[PDB]
Design a binder for this molecule. Structure first.
Ligand SMILES: OCc1ccc(OC(F)F)cc1
Lengths: 300, 237
């Protein structure tokens, strides 16, 4: 179990850790989050009480260092930082844990939700999508745009997701125009899986990370990327059997965890209706189709 | 964006553009089998690719052999159209290639767009106009060359005959769309109008009769009357 301590909480803010969240009052004596499960990435995130604009947060992995938050009154946000000094930090955390000034990562032991949403998400891949090599953790917010969004403006603050575009030369083999546009298996399996991602695990990891950035920060370009990566699989007639079974589990837990009141903006009608009812894989997503029908039959 | 009443004069400016109509590419007669079921038999078709400024018509004849052993033909027809239009553009010299292609049916947008990925600078556009180019097979010389074809074949025509020696492109296109709209609503009557006076002939190198300016005014009037009536004879007014 690991700990991300907080120097203080000078402004009223809603703090999330993974799918959990709690309200902190202005200058409330809040000094961090303990009992964080080791072995998974995590995201700490923030929504100020006064400017519901800008959800922002930090992806991190406690195996990669000792991380903590401190409010910067100049830039006006809670910043994650790394502490080089290991016993100064263990001093800080122990003193805090003794004054019981920390919240406990509130995992139900039966609950595998976080594992299921982050199964293929690795910090190394996150750090390639969110480029900032001087830090072991990654900042994301509501307003950041993707590489592909920039193409159609500040690259230092971009989300460098893999560009997918169904009406592109990368996607359509000269001479197979109709074949490749109606059956994307070429683009999925040869171009993306074999060529770009190398394996389905790295593909699933980017899919999962895009979903989580859409859900936690309302990042529109991430939502576009999540839907694109689903649509590429569902529109391929030939998908490895293990990928299809795993996709069903992945999507299931994403739809399960989505706020019931955010389904209007974060879910794309066209993509989901094609994937569950028209595409090659209309019959290979039983768990995802079942939960989508019982929980969002309006969309459909 | 889409082409409509409001940007109609863009057709006659000096940017090369083509209309592409696919309505006559896949043509069938539907009949009964000995068992009493229904089968289609395909007949030859054509892509109707038209430069509205110059009257140049690229009539790509689609031979029935194209369809042998293929499934979902009406879908394939749209992709076959797009393959042939892309081949046509690649065959033209660069200074003759269009800057825009306007498809008369919106289902041709993605097929053409994907076949033209090599031509990022050629804009593929739909239209809100209900153009009557389906009636091109009511022009006898065009129908004849399509039905007689024994193999794939491109045939070049000027759909305006010599009209551009006396009228503008705008005026020539309006005459053409009036003639085709009339042939589309009531072919027999339209064809009667065009041939009633045996002394006016169709030149061997033309599609339409050799009308004087005064005779075109009378003809065009008769075509308008026809279109309004058939619209009465249809909705009773
Ligand atoms: O001065 C650097 C430093 C300050 C505070 C720390 O704990 C913070 F989490 F509460 C750790 C390091």
């Amino acid at each position: 179990m690991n700990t991300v301590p907080f120097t203080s909480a000078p402004i009223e803010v809603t703090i999330g850790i993974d799918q959990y969240s709690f309200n902190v009052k202005e200058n409330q004596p809040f000094h961090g989050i303990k009992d964080i499960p080791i072995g998974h990435v995590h995201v700490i995130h923030f929504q100020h009480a006064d400017n519901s604009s800008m959800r922002y947060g930090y992806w991190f992995d406690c195996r990669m260092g000792n991380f903590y938050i401190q409010y910067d009154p100049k830039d006006g946000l809670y910043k994650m930082m790394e502490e080089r000094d290991g016993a100064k930090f263990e001093n800080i955390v122990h003193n805090f844990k003794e004054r019981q000034m920390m919240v406990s990562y509130p995992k139900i032991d039966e609950d595998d939700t976080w594992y299921n949403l982050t199964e293929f998400v690795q910090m190394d891949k996150i750090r390639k999508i969110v480029r900032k090599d001087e830090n072991q953790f990654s900042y994301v917010d509501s307003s950041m745009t993707t590489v592909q969004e920039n193409e159609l403006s500040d690259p230092a603050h971009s989300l460098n997701y893999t560009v997918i575009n169904f009406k592109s030369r990368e996607a359509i083999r000269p001479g197979h125009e109709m074949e490749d546009f109606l059956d994307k298996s070429y683009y999925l399996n040869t171009v993306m899986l074999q060529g770009i991602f190398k394996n389905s695990s790295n593909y699933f990891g980017e899919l999962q990370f895009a979903f989580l950035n859409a859900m936690f920060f309302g990042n529109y370009g991430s939502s576009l990327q999540w839907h694109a990566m689903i649509e590429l699989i569902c529109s391929s007639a030939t998908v490895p059997k293990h990928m299809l079974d795993k996709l069903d589990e992945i999507l299931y837990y994403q739809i399960k965890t989505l706020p019931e009141q955010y389904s209007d903006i974060l879910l794309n009608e066209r993509v989901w209706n094609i994937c569950l009812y028209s595409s090659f894989q209309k019959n290979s997503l039983h768990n995802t189709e079942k939960i989508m029908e019982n929980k969002y039959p309006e969309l459909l | 964006g889409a082409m409509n009443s409001s940007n109609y004069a863009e057709l006659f400016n000096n940017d090369i553009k083509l209309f592409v109509d696919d309505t006559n590419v896949y043509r069938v007669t539907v009949h009964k089998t000995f068992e009493g079921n229904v089968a289609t038999k395909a007949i030859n078709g054509c892509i109707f690719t038209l430069n509205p400024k110059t009257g140049h018509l690229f009539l790509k004849i689609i031979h029935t052999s194209v369809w042998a052993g293929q499934k979902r033909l009406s879908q394939l027809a749209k992709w076959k159209t797009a393959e042939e239009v892309s081949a046509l553009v690649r065959s033209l010299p660069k200074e003759e290639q269009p800057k825009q292609i306007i498809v008369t049916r919106k289902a041709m947008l993605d097929p053409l767009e994907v076949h033209m990925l090599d031509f990022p600078n050629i804009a593929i556009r739909p239209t809100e106009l209900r153009l009557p180019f389906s009636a091109a097979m009511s022009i006898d010389k065009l129908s004849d060359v399509v039905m007689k074809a024994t193999e794939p074949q491109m045939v070049l025509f000027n759909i305006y005959d010599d009209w551009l020696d006396r009228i503008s492109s705008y005026t020539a296109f309006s005459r053409l769309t009036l003639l085709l709209r009339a042939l589309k609503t009531n072919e027999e009557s339209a064809k009667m109008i065009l041939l009633s006076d045996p002394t006016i002939t169709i030149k061997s190198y033309h599609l339409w009769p050799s009308f004087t300016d005064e005779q075109w005014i009378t003809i065009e009037s008769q075509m308008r009357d026809l279109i309004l009536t058939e619209y009465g004879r249809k909705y009773n007014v």
